[PDB]
Design a protein around this nucleic acid. Structure first.
Lengths: 251, 193, 204, 173, 106, 130
RNA sequence: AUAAACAUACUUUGAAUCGGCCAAGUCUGGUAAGCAGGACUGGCGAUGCGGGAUGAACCGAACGUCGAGAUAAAGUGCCAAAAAGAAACAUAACGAGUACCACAAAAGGUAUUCAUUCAUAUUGACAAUAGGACCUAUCGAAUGAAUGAGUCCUGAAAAUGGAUGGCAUUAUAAUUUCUUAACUGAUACUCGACCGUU
RNA sequence: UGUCGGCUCUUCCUAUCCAUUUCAAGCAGAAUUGAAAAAAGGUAUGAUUGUUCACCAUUUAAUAGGGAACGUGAGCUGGGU
RNA sequence: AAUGGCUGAAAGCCUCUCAAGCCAGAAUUUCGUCUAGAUGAAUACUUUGUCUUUUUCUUGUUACUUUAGUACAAUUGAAAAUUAUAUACGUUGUAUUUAUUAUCUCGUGUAUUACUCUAUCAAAAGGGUAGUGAAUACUGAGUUAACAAAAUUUAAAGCAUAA
């Protein structure tokens, strides 16, 4: 038969299946569409949320009925210490999506970036980025770097910088840095790399990425709630009190 | 039924040169050059010299011939032979579609770009919306007088279509068409010469 | 023997259902097939009616769990591998050993760019069609149903015609000079004894 | 298809034994020809095979099967509505050849199987007496057309290969 | 060194829609496209030469064969029928055989 | 414009049949598919018969002043007046048919010499170009 | 006329069974039913095998164990053993495709092919342009009306996602007819071997 | 094969009630009426009766019609039977 | 999409097209964005530089160990486009497996290469330069074969050290 009275379905089907993530950081799955007629610019950052607080904001809009005194609004304070660029990677568009062609890395790598390549640092010999650093200036291993740059300028369409946070400036107990690939959107690939190479080992501050009164698309991983029933998870109607074998479930 | 041979031909006046490359006709004339693609895979277009008048000499013509074929596909010879005739006329005596504006109570103001490549219709039936209506390539809009415009151009398929795009953007919705007889209409279609 | 060579089929202007019946029979005959350009293939019917034939094929999907249901592959490389997979034995060993010898690439990858391409006379669109019947390139339909990699194949192809046309120019100058020299030594006096043997059988 | 010349006479009280029923029947063999002839007597002259005898049954070979003639065929066929009469024109070098066309086109255009058509008379008409819209265009002296969008012709089935080498092109022919 | 055979593909056994008679094996000889070119091949020896990996502690050879003949044509495409001393394994379907040139009649 | 038309008098090449690769002269067009080839039986050997357009191939020679339904006595004069046999043997297909006939007569000793000689000449041609 | 000696005529004793069902160039009650009830015959019951993709009844054909060959129904684009050529009416569409069988109607169409009847057709028939329904000039070959027969389109709407069997075809690998002393194929037919009954 | 209804929940059909895009009117405007594309979204609160159904009082843009073993009893309730 | 249209035949006129070619138009479809996601890619460090099987150490993986056996650089594989295809020719008439004159030895230089190797410049190239070797054409001469043999493509045992 037909349901007696029609109702809006509970929960969203665009998120099924509801699989919890593993890595705490949420990878940004898409970057703004590249515009080829502007100076190259970073299109992202990475900050650690701290909390929330309320503000009284003066209304600067037109033809609105909000009080002239102020509007009480909630804000969120995201602490973002400057990040350190530690290389870059050039992607290429093939018939199976992007394909990372090469990846050039800086010389001096901080100990907060080496930790990401190990699962037990206190026993690890901590030899990460050692052969790369010791042979950085050799002529054989300098032509290889110059070869990688010419490969990217010729057979690549997307350039991203492998920037990592600094964990000594945040009160978190974690020590290893969090690595993010921030795409560069701007002029042709000739000047993207020249911009990416100019950023190596150089700290980047948030004001060089974002601007005042700019809207952004925050991407993150929600709060953890563990096993939950049907009433909390989806929102169905709790059954009457008389019910046998319990109430809070789908019938 | 299946015609053994259906033939058509178009005369080439003395001012125009026509060259064909696999049904990609290029027509050159005093007003400019026009090109079209006739992608019917069953006809061949080749220039030739044929006696058109009963008691006349040979004249340069473009001959379109379609051999054994049903009446559904044989109808395209005269369509191809007439699209060419509008490319010879167009580049010799350009086209022009004079257009009027009809309104009942609300005056309509037309804003034409400096180059003439675009128009702008304001205050249609008092509506606050300002329709743009951009023209095609090689079509120029100009204001002849009061409540009248004319669209100069070479390609009839682009002048006329651009003339039907202005009228399609000024339709009356949710109202009796038989009385609210507004819009912009094609008064007459003629040639520049 | 051991037929280890690969029979590359150039699928420019063939028919999807006829270039795949010949492959399906010949895959089971211990042959290896690589169908380059499975995106230029042709199917009968205008673009409007080739979407109704796809909307029908998009409905068939397991109700209780769509993640089990018919996976409707859009890439024209996979719209010919599915077409071949329909004419091969289903759910046994012989229908899979013969399906590992089949490949489509929409473009033309490196090792198959420089191989002796073949053709199937029974599958050509010029032999089995009324020229007024309206066809549809597989690549043209693939984009209409959400194929995101159609500009890449065109760009890769545009850089393959400009690298094979400049190779032809260097190839034809050497081939013309060699042929012009072979005529010189055919008329050589010292080679008159050998030429009369070739001339007798029409080889000169 | 073949043409036969069949004659027979009736020997009983109703019919005199001095009338001979000739016929020129078209049938694939001579036993399907007698069947057409016997039922033509019985439905028209009340003569049954038990009360008659076959006198002659010979094939009629074409005298000049090297000359092209315009054949005119008068026939009647049965449709789901009623019974009609048709008169189709055919070009072929033999009488037994122009009839074979009549069965194929009738069984295709009108979807009437061959056991509904009664061939009444087949004669030869002139050049200008061809009323068919399509047949009329090829009877002239100066008819010429290019056979285009051809397909390459192989010598025999031996040279036909399942898979070829190189690109395939048609012929201006 | 030299080639003295034409590689015929083991298509399968003489069967029906829902049957199989493994006493007779069909072959698609390379180069034969009609049943009128088969009159030559009726009689020529055919061998299914295969290879078996063996351990060093055994006597059996690493290359064996199953010899047979061509007995009659089949269909109008030049497919032939071959009868072997031991019916070919169904693991050879699609593989290549050898069609020798003896007993010759030329 | 199409060069080779299917008219009366056009010399056609019968590709398939017992008379494969023989010259025939059209003397009638029954309809769009069937013609009446009469490549004079006393010259080429193709008798008068109705053939399909899917068996013959056109040649660029038209016998001059040939009317439809010509007799064998008079068609033989026009065919031998223009000497189609002399002209046909010089074209690309004429040299292809004679080439096929010679290589058919080749024995195994004749196939060995040509391969052993062509390779020597072909390699010597490649040496001669720097 | 034809068949009939393991022919013909029986005698005694006795077992099982009397819930039946299906097909139709048949019938009755019923609006109708995979409904109820019958006459003649064949089957399923009691029955496998080759074919209809699957099916108790449909088509071929009834079975000891086999080997080789021609066959029957029916098919020969691939799954699938096996076919090439010829002609047409269709196919700008989930239209066409193995009967029983798993559906489609009345009606409408200036959609298309063929045929029939009638009329106007020349130095002048229609459309068109120009001038004064009708006439003239130019334009120069077919034109107009009615009827019949195929094919096609609308008519055509139901609940899990799916069924010419699937893939797929579109001057076919569809529908209708044909040509070639072509091909494929059952446990049935022929020959040979072996077991048993008479 | 646990045999009515209701509560809870999901999905499907279109012979569409609202929203979107269009034609027709005896469409001047407003209101309305007939039909076409289209099932991605939405389609209520209560008094009496065990009721499906019904009839009333309101509200909304609309308060459309149906199927899933007359959906749903080791899901409930036991009002009726 | 329904619908409104443009040029336009059929059918000299008319027509949005049960014709070729196009435009405008939905809460529609597809990219874009959101969530889950398989085969993959790059980089870092440890190795390995032809090869696997069996026992065996570890929580487990790789490297590693022992006794074996196996080949040792050098002729393969690309025009594109159209099919009513500029004109000419129809160049006919067997796709991969399957296009080398048995082996070895002695001989002069030249020339060639989608050949091998090294160095360099470059390179997600059948790339350029230089050198060397191989094969081949000019193009040789000579020895040997009779009986048997011309099958590798993988087996069996360990845990010292390192990550």
């Amino acid at each position: 038969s037909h349901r007696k009275f029609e109702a809006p379905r509970h929960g969203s089907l665009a998120f099924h299946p509801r699989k919890r993530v593993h890595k705490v950081r949420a990878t940004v799955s898409a970057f703004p569409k590249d515009n080829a007629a502007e100076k190259p610019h970073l299109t992202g950052f990475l900050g650690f949320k701290a909390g929330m607080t309320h503000v009284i904001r003066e209304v600067k809009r037109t033809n609105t009925k909000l009080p002239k005194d102020g509007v009480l609004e909630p804000v969120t304070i995201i602490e973002t210490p400057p990040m350190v660029v530690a290389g870059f990677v050039g992607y290429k568009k093939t018939t199976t999506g992007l394909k990372p062609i090469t990846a050039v890395f800086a010389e001096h790598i901080a100990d907060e970036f080496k930790r990401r390549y190990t699962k037990k640092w206190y026993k690890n010999t901590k030899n990460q980025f050692a052969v790369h650093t010791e042979k950085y200036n050799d002529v054989k291993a300098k032509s290889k770097r110059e070869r990688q740059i010419r490969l990217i300028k010729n057979r690549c369409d997307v350039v991203r910088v492998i920037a990592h946070t600094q964990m000594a400036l945040v009160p978190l107990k974690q020590k290893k840095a969090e690595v993010m690939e921030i795409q560069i959107n701007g002029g042709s690939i000739a000047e993207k790399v020249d911009f990416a190479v100019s950023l190596l080992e150089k700290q980047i501050s948030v004001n060089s990425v974002f601007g005042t009164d700019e809207c952004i698309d925050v991407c993150s991983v929600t709060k953890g709630h563990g096993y939950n029933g049907v009433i909390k998870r989806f929102g169905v109607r709790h059954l009457p009190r008389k019910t046998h074998r319990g109430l809070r479930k789908v019938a | 039924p299946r015609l053994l041979k259906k033939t058509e031909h178009v005369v080439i006046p003395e001012g125009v040169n026509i060259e064909i490359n696999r049904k990609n006709i290029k027509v050159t004339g005093p007003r400019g050059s026009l090109t079209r693609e006739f992608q019917h895979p069953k006809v061949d277009i080749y220039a030739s010299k044929l006696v058109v008048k009963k008691e006349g000499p040979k004249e340069n013509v473009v001959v379109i011939d379609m051999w054994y074929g049903n009446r559904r596909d044989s109808a395209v010879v005269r369509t191809i032979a007439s699209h060419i005739k509008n490319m010879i006329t167009g580049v010799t005596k350009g086209y022009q579609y004079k257009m009027r504006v009809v309104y009942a109570h609300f005056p309509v103001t037309l804003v034409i770009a400096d180059d003439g490549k675009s128009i702008q219709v304001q205050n249609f039936l008092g509506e606050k919306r300002t329709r743009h209506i951009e023209m095609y390539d090689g079509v120029v809009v100009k204001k002849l007088g009061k409540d009248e415009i004319c669209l100069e151009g070479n390609d009839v398929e682009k002048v006329s279509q651009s003339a039907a795009n202005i009228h399609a953007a000024n339709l009356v919705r949710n109202k009796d068409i038989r009385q609210f007889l507004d819009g912009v209409y094609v008064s007459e279609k003629c040639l520049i010469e | 023997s051991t037929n280890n060579k690969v029979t590359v089929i150039d699928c420019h202007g063939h028919v999807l259902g006829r270039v795949a019946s010949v492959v399906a029979k010949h895959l089971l005959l211990g042959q290896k097939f690589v169908l380059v350009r499975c995106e230029d293939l042709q199917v009968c019917g205008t673009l409007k009616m080739r979407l109704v034939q796809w909307e029908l094929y998009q409905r068939k999907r397991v109700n209780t769990n769509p993640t089990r249901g018919a996976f409707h592959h859009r890439s024209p490389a996979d719209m010919v591998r599915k077409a071949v997979r329909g004419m091969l034995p289903k759910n046994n060993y012989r229908g899979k050993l013969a399906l590992k010898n089949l490949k489509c690439f929409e473009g033309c990858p490196a090792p198959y760019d420089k191989m002796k391409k073949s053709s199937i006379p029974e599958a050509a669109a010029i032999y089995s069609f009324n020229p007024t019947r309206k066809r549809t390139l597989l690549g043209e339909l693939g984009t209409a149903v959400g194929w995101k990699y159609a500009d890449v194949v065109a760009k890769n192809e545009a850089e393959r015609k400009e690298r094979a046309a400049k190779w032809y120019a260097a190839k034809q100058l050497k081939q013309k000079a060699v042929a012009e020299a072979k005529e010189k030594i055919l008329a050589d006096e010292k080679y008159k004894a050998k030429v009369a043997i070739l001339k007798k059988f029409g080889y000169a | 298809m073949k043409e036969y010349y069949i004659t027979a006479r009736c020997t009983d009280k109703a019919h005199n034994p001095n009338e001979i029923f000739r016929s020129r029947v078209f049938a694939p063999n001579y036993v399907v020809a007698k069947s057409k002839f016997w039922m033509m007597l019985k439905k028209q002259h009340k003569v049954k095979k038990i009360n008659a005898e076959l006198l002659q049954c010979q094939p009629i070979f074409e005298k000049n099967p090297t000359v092209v003639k315009n054949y005119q065929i008068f026939l009647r066929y049965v449709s789901a509505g009623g019974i009609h009469n048709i008169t189709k024109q055919y070009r072929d070098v033999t009488r037994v050849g122009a009839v074979r066309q009549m069965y194929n086109d009738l069984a295709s255009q009108y979807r009437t199987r061959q056991d509904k058509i009664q061939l009444i008379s087949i004669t030869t008409v002139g050049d200008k007496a061809v009323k068919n819209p399509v047949l009329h265009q090829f009877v002239g002296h100066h008819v010429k057309f290019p056979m285009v969008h051809c397909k390459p012709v192989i010598a025999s089935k031996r040279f036909n290969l399942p898979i070829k080498a190189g690109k395939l092109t048609t012929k201006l022919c | 060194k030299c080639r003295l055979h034409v590689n015929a593909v083991f298509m399968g056994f003489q069967r029906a829609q829902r049957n199989q008679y493994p006493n007779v094996a069909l072959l698609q000889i390379s180069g034969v496209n009609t049943k009128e070119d088969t009159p030559f091949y009726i009689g020529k020896r055919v061998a299914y030469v295969y290879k078996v990996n063996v351990k060093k502690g055994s006597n059996k050879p690493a290359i064996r064969a199953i010899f047979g003949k061509i007995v009659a044509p089949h269909g109008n495409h030049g497919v032939v029928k071959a009868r072997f001393l031991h019916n070919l394994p169904p693991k050879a379907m699609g593989q290549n055989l050898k069609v020798f040139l003896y007993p010759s009649n030329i | 414009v199409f060069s080779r038309f299917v008219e009366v008098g056009r010399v056609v090449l019968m590709k398939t049949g017992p008379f494969a690769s023989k010259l025939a002269v059209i003397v009638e067009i029954l309809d769009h598919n069937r013609v009446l080839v009469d490549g004079p039986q006393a010259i080429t050997g193709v008798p008068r018969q109705v053939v399909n357009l899917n068996t013959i191939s056109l040649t660029s020679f038209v016998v001059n002043k040939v009317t439809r339904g010509m007799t064998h006595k008079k068609l033989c004069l026009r065919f031998t007046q223009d000497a189609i046999i002399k002209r046909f043997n010089k074209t690309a297909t004429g040299k292809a048919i004679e080439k096929r006939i010679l290589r058919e007569k080749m024995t195994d000793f004749d196939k060995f010499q040509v391969s052993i000689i062509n390779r020597k000449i072909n390699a010597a041609a490649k040496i001669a170009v720097s």
